[PDB]
Nucleic acid binder design. Structure first.
Ligand SMILES: [Mg+2]
Ligand SMILES: [Mg+2]
Ligand SMILES: [Mg+2]
Ligand SMILES: [Mg+2]
Ligand SMILES: [Mg+2]
Ligand SMILES: [Mg+2]
Ligand SMILES: [Mg+2]
Ligand SMILES: [Mg+2]
Ligand SMILES: [Mg+2]
Ligand SMILES: [Mg+2]
Ligand SMILES: [Mg+2]
Ligand SMILES: [Mg+2]
Ligand SMILES: [Mg+2]
Ligand SMILES: [Mg+2]
Ligand SMILES: [Mg+2]
Ligand SMILES: [Mg+2]
Ligand SMILES: [Mg+2]
Ligand SMILES: [Mg+2]
Ligand SMILES: [Mg+2]
Ligand SMILES: [Mg+2]
Ligand SMILES: [Mg+2]
Lengths: 184, 167, 260, 141
RNA sequence: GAUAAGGGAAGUCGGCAAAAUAGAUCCGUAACUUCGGGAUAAGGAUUGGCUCUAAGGAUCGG
RNA sequence: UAUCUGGUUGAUCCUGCCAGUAGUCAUAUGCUUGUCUCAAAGAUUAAGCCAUGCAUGUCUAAGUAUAAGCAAUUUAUACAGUGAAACUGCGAAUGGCUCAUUAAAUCAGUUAUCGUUUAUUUGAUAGUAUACUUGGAUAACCGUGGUAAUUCUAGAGCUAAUACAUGCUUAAAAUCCCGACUGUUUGGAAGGGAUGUAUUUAUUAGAUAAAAAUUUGAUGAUUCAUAAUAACUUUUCGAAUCGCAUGGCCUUGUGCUGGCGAUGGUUCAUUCAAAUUUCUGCCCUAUCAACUUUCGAUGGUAGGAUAGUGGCCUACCAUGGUUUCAACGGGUAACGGGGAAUAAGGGUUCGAUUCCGGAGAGGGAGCCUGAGAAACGGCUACC
RNA sequence: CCCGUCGCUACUACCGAUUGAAUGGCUUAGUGAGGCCUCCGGAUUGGUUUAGGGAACCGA
């Protein structure tokens, strides 16, 4: 069994430690989910204490939040474009935490147009919109992407732990950072 | 003597790890799994006996198989099962239609009938009423204990209001 | 080892139970309950070794299965129920009420009280915090959780519980001059007033306590139980001896004069 | 030395800087006091480094034992080794012998330590195979 | 000049003849020793095609 | 009892050992042996192998009874007393034995969990935006059996649940979003959705140095408790259960209400625990001086996994980490400690063994169930 | 008094061809049972259940 104990390692002085006891069940590990993109398939795992975990083996959509306006919508994920841990994860389009993905922009464009009245990519309702006006100008580098119809996002949930693939839309210098990293 | 297991497509024997819910095995303790040899699902010459079920009755009577019949040993026991099998609508009283098998102990005979399950009775309705009355009374006890604490807090806060003004 | 232990060796039982070595191999292992194992008193020990009502464990079980014994106003049928400090035991068949208070000699005294005092008990607040739906609550030393406490209550105070509604009758704030009984260490059972609290953050606060005989001792804050608002005014009756520790020479002289 | 020197973006968790805000374009910084009367260095209030294991801006907590020792190596990235000297009593000879133990502690960029300083380190949760302590105070040597 | 089931020197004075090994990269390498060797000791792993990535330079412009 | 005596020489004084002397909770053995109390006992060599028998099962008024079981006619033609066998629930992870492995390992004293899970016990905690009560299986049983053989089980006919899967019954407002119309200086609005609790994200309260030109908890300390917003979910559970009593209301009913109990259920706390964990402390050996780092060794970033921290594992990147204050290696006729023998004091020797901790059930390894096992009087595979 | 070859008897350890032998630990390389996760698979077995012979699509 996969074991997380530190006994099998050699000590800080470099001495090999002798075998103390048989592997115990309270230090087990399991195998990575390696979440892909495909029709949703989640398997439950019975964990210590009788609790439940959900392995997302394949998912298509997730709930992603646009932080500045504070609104979240569920949208499909197109693919993985960047992963700080392993490039084989980008190549196989494996969903893990902190993975950079492209998400569908329609729910956010629709919310934006209904809430502010402007477009992207580049009586009472009208009064509410006129009041909300002025705050409707967003950053150019984020606005330009809606023209391509795909937003950059990072997964925040842990799909191998909860079966969900949720995240937030990149903005500010974090967005500038991953654009520079991606383009190189 | 090894029995046949459905889905194993062989005329021979294979060894499987059988568990609870599998045929050809009865687990002795909870969670126990045994590796047992079982015969495939393909008919061959190595069978000592084959079990057959008559789907369509033939021409000639079978001596002890198609002429007689054995009544079912037990009647229905659940209330909705009594309603479904034969005899009544939801407004009928199931209590006096249950089949009772009478036993003969020498000279005096008495009847035995099953205990009906899922039968609505005044005790059942009393328990339902008790549960909902307790739930409502509890909800009121909680929301007035909360209201009383809100009075206590308002009094303390008012006292702290005058305390700051004084100091 | 692979799960919780269910036996208790006689030699490994708490010493303040005063069990004899040779009556057998095992001792009553207290059940899970309001009080910790080392600081509790099982009802079999209370009813058989102290009160001597039962001659053996079969008889104590016969006694308890007739619904006579009540702890904190509720009938208990668990023979190894972990009764503990300040708990009230009622035996209405004999019409007797006991309180489990430590005596100054370190053991649980059998301190009988009248029914009027047996109608309540005190509990030291271990923590106060907010529960679900934003309801604050206090957890006492016997594991009780009482919601909607007086907003002035903080940790280490002592509350007086109505014990029939589970509500708070009144409380004592932790401060200088309060009467205290010590519930741990070698000074177990002594009663005095707090003279000075010396705090040690990230560590253990220490409390300096002055006895009624002007004896001063120091103990950890976790072993301090406030039982009265000032000297000579305890909220519960003290056991015989009034929690005053005498040296062995004074005890020997007192015993000689009392018996001759 | 730059903060975004890794293949991943370095930032404090759950600290959100809203781009649609006022002209006060200063990156929001989170910090905490470790308690026990230890002062937060101003390099944490005014700095820009990101360290999840740092006592003041990270999620570790200081609890347990407080030890002092001499820094003997700064050749690891963000990790030091301190040396603790003590006297062991040998009852048979009614005398003592010098002994020492090496304890590995994490040092945040809010402190600058070189070999020879005497530091005070507080215990934290296990943050590595050999590192379980985290520097709280530095005295120049 | 080739191949050959199973065995593998039982053939023969004798392993005669044939077979097996073989290039390169990486790992590893004993007794003994005249300290130079033994040594390619012994004993192991890899090797194609295709699509990429990185490193290694020159001349001009202060 | 803080003690000494014989032995080298022809004789002497010394160094020095041999011998004598006493104890042993220290074993064996020889001889002898009347009484009372107390009482060790396959540790040493073989953690070698085992014939045979036993050591873990369990039912109350309160889960399931048509035994074709017993008993009596009784408040009873639904059952009602007693009661095998089975299904369901729980226990079997405790105990008992042994000390093989194990030398910073175990363990001892001392810490921490603001780094986690926790059956059970004990406290609290749920009005939430077909209903007089939902489904279809299955056991025991009967009768056809196959094998020499097992705690093997297969066809066929029934039939149950606190087993399995679904599903209503209900307060009063209030708040939020969209919003046709309308007022038309930005208000009013018909109509639609959403509110409990769990899960997963993202974003906000969660304050507290003393005068001039409204609330806000704890800690030494937190991104804590808790609350709110936007969404999300192969939708967790907000009782389709069981026993005794039968009370109260009369606008002529199997009407509406209700008393003491069993069990279960979400979350928080507690307890019994568990898992990691700080500091310091282990016998001999240098005829062991360098060890660790291919292929994790030390650290960083990101991830995966875990109940959770952590190179526990993966990817990328640095070259670190231990050591004459003895690392590393080797030996141990080594389970550790509380303790035991002997002892003026200081010490020397022993500690498998009545208590505590750890480990094992021929040797490894891998798992199911379960709160809890890498369990062996559980399973799977190899030797 | 006494020393050493040489000669006799007994015992102990050492060296010693045998690429001697046995047991245990660690380990390179090759093969690799079995469990677990995953991937399809779809024996048979219930109907989201629809249908005038029954042709679809849902679950296990
Ligand atoms: Mg051939
Ligand atoms: Mg061949
Ligand atoms: Mg050959
Ligand atoms: Mg020959
Ligand atoms: Mg020949
Ligand atoms: Mg010859
Ligand atoms: Mg020749
Ligand atoms: Mg030749
Ligand atoms: Mg050679
Ligand atoms: Mg070679
Ligand atoms: Mg290749
Ligand atoms: Mg002697
Ligand atoms: Mg033996
Ligand atoms: Mg045990
Ligand atoms: Mg015994
Ligand atoms: Mg990590
Ligand atoms: Mg021992
Ligand atoms: Mg031994
Ligand atoms: Mg033991
Ligand atoms: Mg085992
Ligand atoms: Mg020899």
């Amino acid at each position: 069994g996969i074991s997380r104990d530190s006994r099998h390692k050699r000590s800080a002085t470099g001495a090999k430690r002798a075998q103390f006891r048989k592997k115990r069940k309270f230090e087990l590990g399991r195998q990575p989910a390696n979440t892909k993109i495909g029709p949703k398939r989640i398997h439950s795992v019975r964990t210590r204490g009788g609790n439940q975990k959900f392995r997302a083996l394949r998912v298509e959509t997730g709930n992603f939040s646009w932080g500045s306006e504070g609104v979240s919508r569920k949208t499909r994920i197109a693919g993985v474009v960047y992963h700080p841990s392993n490039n084989e994860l980008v190549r196989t389009n494996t969903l893990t935490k902190s993975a950079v993905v492209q998400i569908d922009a329609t729910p956010f464009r629709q919310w934006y147009e209904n809430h502010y009245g402007a477009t992207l990519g580049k009586r009472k309702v009208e009064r509410k919109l006129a009041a909300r006006s002025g705050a409707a100008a967003i950053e150019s580098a984020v606005d330009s992407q809606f023209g391509s119809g795909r937003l950059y996002a990072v997964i925040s949930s842990r799909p191998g732990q909860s079966g969900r693939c949720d995240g937030y839309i990149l903005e500010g210098e974090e967005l500038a950072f991953y654009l520079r990293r991606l383009t190189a | 003597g090894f029995p046949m297991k459905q889905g194993v497509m062989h005329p021979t024997r294979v060894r499987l790890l059988l568990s609870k819910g599998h045929s050809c095995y009865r687990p002795r303790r909870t969670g126990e799994r045994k590796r047992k040899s079982v015969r495939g699902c393909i008919v061959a010459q190595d069978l000592s006996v084959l079990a057959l079920s008559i789907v369509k009755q033939g021409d000639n009577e079978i001596e002890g198989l198609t002429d007689t019949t054995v009544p079912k040993r037990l009647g229905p026991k659940r209330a909705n099962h009594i309603r479904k099998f034969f005899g009544l609508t939801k407004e009928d009283d199931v209590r006096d239609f249950v089949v009772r098998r009478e036993v003969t102990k020498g000279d005096k005979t008495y009847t035995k009938a099953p205990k009906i399950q899922r039968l609505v009775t005044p005790q059942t309705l009393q328990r339902k009423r008790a549960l909902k009355a307790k739930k409502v009374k509890n909800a009121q006890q909680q929301r007035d204990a909360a209201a009383e604490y809100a009075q206590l807090l308002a009094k303390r806060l008012h006292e702290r209001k005058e305390e700051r003004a004084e100091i | 080892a692979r799960g919780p232990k269910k036996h208790l060796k006689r030699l490994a039982a708490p010493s303040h139970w005063m069990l004899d070595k040779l009556s057998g191999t095992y001792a009553p292992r207290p059940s899970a309950g309001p009080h910790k194992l080392r600081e509790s008193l099982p009802l079999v020990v209370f009813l058989r070794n102290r009160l001597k009502y039962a001659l053996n464990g079969r008889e104590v079980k016969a006694i308890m299965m007739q619904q006579h014994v009540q702890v904190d106003g509720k009938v208990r049928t668990d023979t190894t129920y972990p009764a503990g400090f300040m708990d009230v035991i009622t035996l209405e068949a004999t019409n007797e009420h006991f309180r489990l208070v430590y005596d100054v000699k370190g053991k649980f005294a059998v301190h009988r009280i009248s029914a009027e005092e047996a109608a309540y008990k005190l509990g030291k607040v271990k923590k106060v915090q907010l529960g679900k739906k934003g309801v604050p609550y206090v957890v006492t030393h016997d594991g009780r959780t009482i919601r909607y406490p007086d907003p002035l209550i903080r940790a280490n105070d002592t509350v007086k519980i109505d014990l029939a509604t589970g509500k708070i009758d009144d409380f004592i704030k932790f401060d200088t001059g309060r009467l205290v009984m010590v519930t741990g260490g070698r000074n177990l059972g002594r009663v005095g007033v707090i003279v000075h609290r010396e705090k040690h953050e990230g560590g253990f606060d220490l409390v300096h306590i002055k006895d009624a005989l002007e004896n001063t001792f120091v103990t950890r804050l976790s072993n301090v139980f406030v039982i009265g608002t000032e000297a000579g005014k305890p909220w519960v009756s003290l056991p015989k001896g009034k929690g005053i520790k005498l040296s062995i020479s004074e005890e020997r002289d007192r015993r000689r004069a009392q018996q001759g | 030395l730059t903060v975004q020197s890794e293949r991943a973006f370095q930032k404090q968790p759950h600290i959100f800087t809203n781009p649609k805000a006022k002209a006060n374009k200063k990156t929001k910084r989170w910090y905490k006091d470790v308690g026990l009367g230890f002062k937060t260095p101003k390099a944490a209030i005014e700095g820009s480094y990101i360290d999840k294991k740092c006592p003041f801006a990270g999620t570790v907590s200081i609890r347990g034992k407080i030890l002092t020792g001499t820094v003997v190596s700064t050749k690891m990235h963000r990790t030091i080794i301190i040396r603790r000297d003590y006297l062991h009593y040998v009852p048979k000879y009614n005398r003592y012998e010098k002994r020492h133990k090496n304890v590995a502690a994490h040092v945040s960029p809010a402190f600058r330590v070189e070999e020879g300083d005497v530091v005070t380190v507080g215990q934290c949760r296990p943050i590595s195979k050999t590192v379980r302590f985290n520097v709280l105070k530095v005295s120049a040597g």
